[PDB]
């Protein structure tokens, strides 16, 4: 029996994301019109099981958290997906110590990984950011989070 497929997620799993050549967005609808760092060709890693795939190769309509389909949020007529995760999402410049902070850096609310997916091989992965602390982009960014509760 193979390992748990990357489409299968459980709360408390560790998610590793790489965002190559990520670029800054001034406003992101799935983040409540707040800044984001997003990548054309990001990659997602489940650290516990060692399974991984490119985000653009993932059929986000059939991705499960705790056995339940992922929350879908439609803003601007675009389907966005929400991978919740306990605590804030920590991201840094790839291979270097310089670090970014999310928009709600000063509060107690957590964050979630957002994916825009077109039915097909085109997905964008969105990470909450407060400003251009890592620059305007393109810039390689690595992020780390721990999968959180199934949203209600």
């Amino acid at each position, epitope marked *: 029996a193979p390992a748990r497929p990357i489409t299968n997620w459980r709360s408390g799993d560790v998610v590793w994301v790489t965002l190559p050549s990520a670029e*800054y967005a001034q*406003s992101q609808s799935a983040m409540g019109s707040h800044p984001a760092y997003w990548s054309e060709e990001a990659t997602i890693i489940n650290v516990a099981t060692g399974q991984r795939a490119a985000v653009s190769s993932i059929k986000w309509d059939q991705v499960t958290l705790n056995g339940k389909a992922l929350h879908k949020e439609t803003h601007s007529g675009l389907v966005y997906y929400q991978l919740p995760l306990m605590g804030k999402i920590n991201f840094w410049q790839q291979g270097t110590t310089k670090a970014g902070y999310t928009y709600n850096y000063n509060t107690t609310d957590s964050d979630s990984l957002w994916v825009w997916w077109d039915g097909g091989s085109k997905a964008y992965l969105y990470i909450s950011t407060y*400003t*251009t602390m890592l*620059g*305007a982009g393109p810039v390689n960014i690595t992020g780390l989070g721990a999968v959180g509760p199934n949203p209600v």
Partner: antibody
Amino acid sequence: QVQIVQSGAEVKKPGASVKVSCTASGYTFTRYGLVWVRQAPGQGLEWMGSINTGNANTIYSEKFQGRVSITRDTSASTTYMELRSLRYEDTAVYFCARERGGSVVEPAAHYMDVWGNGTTVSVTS
Amino acid sequence: QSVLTQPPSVSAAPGQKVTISCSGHSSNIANNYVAWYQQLPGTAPKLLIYDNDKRPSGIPDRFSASKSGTSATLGITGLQTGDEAHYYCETWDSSLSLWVFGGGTMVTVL
């Protein structure tokens, strides 16, 4: 591919309302922002104001009290710059460029990668 | 009266090196990122450097830049004659809320 085309050269009088337009093609109009920079005959680059092609948000230079308005037309994929009460100092080449970044919070980063060839505005008599 | 003061002009022999300086005032450069542009005579400005050291895909390796403290530095290793252009540094200023440009620097191969 990516291109930005501006209007033609303009000759005006002391006190007028110039409107210079910048049409962009080859990319998603709302994905990026647009800037407006003027350059006098002998002078450097002077930022005038930016626009948000998605939310029509605008910032301006405080050099002009109120004389500048930047407007977008998403359907026509063009931006418009307006100047008012012209004197013999608005005589400059006016550049429209594509914005990458654009934050004004203190860790701010923003550059212009695709430029227009500019429009020459003259204020004479 | 440019906020980001630059040398008016620099020069080097063909194949030599030039460094272009760009002084700030600790509200411009010390905190924010800096971009570099070059303008050939009678043409549109061109992107050279963004995010204080990054090159767009069309710029060769001769152009390198870095920023330390209140000043940012642009350099060209190998000065071909086709580099007769003005060079500008740009960053945000918080005191005067603007995208201030550098004053320009005309490099001449002579």
